[PDB]
Amino acid sequence: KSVVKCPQCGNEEMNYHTLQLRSADEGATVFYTCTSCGYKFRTNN
């Protein structure tokens, strides 16, 4: 019953990881970190 488009070089492959930092009231900060060229940035809301 348990059965029942990276701006520097140009490459669509670039890593990202989001964290909800301070509270649930704000937006999750969408971080971006590159592998092809190496430019990094973030985006909130």
- Give residues in contact with other proteins (CB under 8 A): 3, 15-24, 29, 31, 33, 35, 40, 42
Distance (Å, whole) CA 24 – CA 39: 28
Least CB distance from residue 7 to other proteins, whole Å? 18
Contact call for residue 36 and Zn ion (CB under 5 A): yes
Is the Cβ–Cβ distance between 36 and 13 less than 8 Å?
yes
> Could you give the CA distance from residue 18 to residue 6 in angstroms, rounded to a whole number?
17
Residue list, annotated binding site for Zn(2+): 6, 9, 34, 37
- Cβ proximity to Zn ion: between 9 and 28 the closer is 9
